[PDB]
Design a protein around this nucleic acid. Structure first.
Ligand SMILES: [Zn+2]
Length: 252
DNA sequence: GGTAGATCCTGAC
DNA sequence: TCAGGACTAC
């Protein structure tokens, strides 16, 4: 899931778990647990805590309990569901939080790429994976000025810059390619080669593209098909190690 | 320090 | 054979 989907999860999951008290935590793929490194310590500390809130930072979910916060990233295919402890688990369920009311919060992930970190609330923001996280793309903290500062200071491509979590929080591949197309900028351009006008325009399209989503694709996954704006075949290459889609006519 | 590289894991080739 | 987000060593 991408940022907009993660926000939808935050909104819809919260009422389904708020005020419930953890009675058990069951872990079927320990690699997912990143802190405490010992999955048994992870499970033990959460027991007896009540869910008080659920926040999002970038593509991370932050479950707020009594003492601790649980920081969760779903990566490509992770998913949460709330269901009865009386029913069989779905395939690829790797972590389960059991509540005193007989319901469960279940984490599934076919690829097993997702991560979980637990810390005392007051420490969560200054430890990985939240430490160093850039500003929310939809917040005043993410400004053309901030983007300009990072752009001028690097030798990397503009695509690499946008993919960097320290630059802006949770801006995914699909939105990078769509934003660059909408801003008329080739993904392979050196970030420092962008004019102030290009930076401004890119910031604007980033906010609009992801803003629209949180509430129709031009290039992403459209290789070999005609550009919706000029009819030129969309091309796909690799930029910053990622599948990268662009129109060689609309983007410069 | 900035930056590439390595890394996980398995469905779809 | 390999893409895909967010500690190590060049
Ligand atoms: Zn075009």
């Amino acid at each position: 899931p991408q940022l907009p989907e993660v926000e939808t999860i935050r909104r819809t999951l919260l009422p389904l778990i708020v005020g419930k008290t953890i009675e058990d935590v069951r872990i079927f793929w320990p690699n997912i647990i990143r802190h405490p490194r010992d999955s048994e310590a992870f499970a033990a500390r959460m027991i007896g805590q009540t869910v008080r809130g659920l926040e999002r930072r970038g593509k991370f979910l932050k479950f707020l309990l009594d003492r601790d916060a649980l920081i969760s990233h779903l990566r490509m295919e992770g998913r949460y569901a709330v269901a009865s402890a009386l029913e069989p688990l779905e395939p690829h369920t790797h972590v389960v939080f059991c509540f005193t009311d007989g319901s469960e919060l279940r984490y599934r992930d076919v690829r097993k790429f997702g991560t979980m970190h637990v810390y005392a609330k007051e420490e969560a923001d200054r430890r990985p994976p939240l430490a160093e996280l850039g500003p929310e793309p939809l917040s005043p903290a993410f400004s053309p000025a901030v983007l300009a500062e990072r752009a001028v200071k690097t030798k990397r491509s503009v695509k690499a810059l946008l993919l960097d979590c320290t630059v802006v929080a949770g801006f995914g591949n699909i939105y990078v390619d769509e934003s660059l197309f909408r801003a008329g900028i080739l993904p392979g351009r050196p970030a420092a080669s962008l004019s102030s006008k290009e930076i401004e325009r890119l910031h604007e399209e980033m906010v609009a593209t992801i803003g629209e989503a949180v509430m129709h694709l031009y290039v992403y996954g459209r290789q070999g098909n005609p550009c919706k704006r000029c009819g030129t075949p969309i091309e796909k290459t690799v930029v910053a190690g990622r599948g990268t889609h662009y129109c060689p006519r609309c983007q410069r």
